[PDB]
Amino acid sequence: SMEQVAMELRLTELTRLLRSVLDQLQDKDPARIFAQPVSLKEVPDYLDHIKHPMDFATMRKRLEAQGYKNLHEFEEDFDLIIDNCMKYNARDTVFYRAAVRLRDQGGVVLRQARREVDSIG
């Protein structure tokens, strides 16, 4: 149907906008701390601590399959990156501190993304 096509075009357009958002957020992680999944070979107890691991590579795979239906879903995954790190790592670590800086800098990007998503529909 034409209605299904139109809904598909909207998903494609959201996907484009979320790719630009993802790029902007990942620039706020210049150390690449959050670029890839925590390795279970290197942190073998990780899944005893963290129930829903997340990272930028994993988000990028989901995005390229058009797997985010709305900005809320995308933000959920971004917040898991931050929130997982702030539980597993202590305050005095480079990991925790990187998460805080990514959260603070990313809030700005997400604030305007929400306006764009709402505005364009």
Side-chain angles (χ1 to χ4, degrees), residues 59 62 67-68 70-78:
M59 294 189 63
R62 184 165 167 189
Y68 297 114
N70 57 49
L71 180 56
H72 181 71
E73 289 187 347
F74 177 95
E75 294 177 323
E76 285 193 334
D77 270 357
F78 178 67

Side-chain angles (χ1 to χ4, degrees), residues 19 39-40 52 60 67 73 77 87 96-97 108 117-118:
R19 187 174 308 120
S39 175
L40 305 164
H52 296 101
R60 192 164 302 273
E73 289 187 347
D77 270 357
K87 296 171 186 73
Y96 186 112
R97 289 163 175 282
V108 181
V117 167
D118 286 355

